[PDB]
Amino acid sequence: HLYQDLQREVGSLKEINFMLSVLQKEFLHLSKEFATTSKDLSAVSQDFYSCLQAFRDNYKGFESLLDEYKNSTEEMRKLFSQEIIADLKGSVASLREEIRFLTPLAEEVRRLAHNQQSLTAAIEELKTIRDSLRDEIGQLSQLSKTLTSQIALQRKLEHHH
Ligand code: NA
Ligand code: NA
């Protein structure tokens, strides 16, 4: 019931992995389209590729962590503290909300540029989203890395049985 509870809360990680694959390329494309129009917008759009790639690099690790929680022992669950579970839930929820904001901005920038409108607010929003995603994907990455290492060490120390 704990695993079915957290899994419901976090949702499909594969869905996030796929959507970030789509969006990282959409924004690399945008970065090439505007290289000679807005240096500033091109730079932030290019930044999004590596920012989103960090989640994909860690995707197998995140799925593995969820599986470990699914098959957890009484000793393993102590590593899954309430603080850590809350951090997992809140960073994944943050990713989903940020993606909701990020998705329409590529076309919005294309539309603004066509009608010669100011790109300032779009660039500011893209910078804010990039920084937020960097923070949350990095927190998720570190959380998963630490927990998996702790689980491995606990199992290694149980090997004597
Ligand atoms: Na596309
Ligand atoms: Na968090």
Numbering used by the authors: 91 to 251
Please quote the authors directly.
IncA is a protein of 273 amino acids composed of a short, cytoplasmic N-terminal moiety (residues 1–34), a bilobed transmembrane domain (residues 35–84), and a long cytoplasmic C-terminal domain that ends in a tail with low complexity (residues 247–273). We demonstrate that IncA folds into a stable, non-canonical four-helix bundle that is maintained as a monomer by intramolecular interactions.
To characterize these regions, we first generated a G144A hinge mutant variant and found that IncA87–246(G144A) remains monomeric in solution and it has comparable structural stability as IncA87–246. Though this crystal form did not diffract as well as the previous one, we were able to collect 88.1% complete data to 1.95 Å resolution and determine an accurate atomic model of IncA87–246(G144A) using molecular replacement. Interestingly, the two IncA87–246(G144A) protomers in the triclinic unit cell are noticeably dissimilar (RMSD 1.65 Å), with protomer B characterized by a local unfolding of helix A between residues 100VGSL103. Secondary structure superimposition of IncA87–246 with the reference IncA87–246(G144A) protomer A reveals the G144A mutation results in significant conformational changes throughout the molecule (RMSD 1.68 Å), especially in the helix HD, which is shifted upwards in IncA87–246(G144A). Simulation of IncA87–246(G144A) revealed a spike in RMSF at residue 231, a feature which is absent in both the IncA87–246 and IncA87–237 RMSF profiles. This result agrees with the structural plasticity of IncA87–246(G144A) protomers seen in the triclinic crystal form, which deviate significantly at the C-terminus of helix HD. However, when G144 of the hinge is mutated to alanine, the HD–Hclamp distance narrows and results in a significantly less flexible Hclamp during simulation compared with IncA87–246 and IncA87–237, which may explain experimental results regarding the lack of IncA87–246(G144A) oligomerization in solution.
